[PDB]
Design a binder for this molecule. Sequence first.
Ligand SMILES: C[C@@H]1C(=O)N(C)c2ccc(-c3ccc[nH]3)cc2N1C1CC1
Length: 124
Amino acid sequence: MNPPPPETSNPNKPKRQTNQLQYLLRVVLKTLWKHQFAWPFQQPVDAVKLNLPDYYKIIKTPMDMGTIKKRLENNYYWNAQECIQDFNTMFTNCYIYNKPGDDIVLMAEALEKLFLQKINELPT
Ligand SMILES: C[C@@H]1C(=O)N(C)c2ccc(-c3ccc[nH]3)cc2N1C1CC1
């Protein structure tokens, strides 16, 4: 019922280590991680544990902060924009699967606004 998690390594993918990417890990991610609403987004959605066989029938591009953290630690990304895309996929997935006002959407909304606050300004 659970698909394979997103990849966190890809040896033929060209990696790069930029100051903006070190800041996504050290500042942006690792503080979202400590938020009280972070825990549902710290690993892939477990459709078996949740008894939600419907999740991966709706969400075809899954993403979680657990995956993003490992991609940052492993220098998976070419630039910060690629990592910011993964965050936005994580948020959008939650808004697509759930409905306005759901508890999980409130958590996503709060994390997103803190996220956007923190990447308004990145190192140069
Ligand atoms: C599937 C949907 C969703 O979009 N996310 C991101 C998510 C992540 C984690 C958990 C979760 C609850 C208890 C253990 N894990 C639940 C969700 N939900 C929503 C329906 C409660």
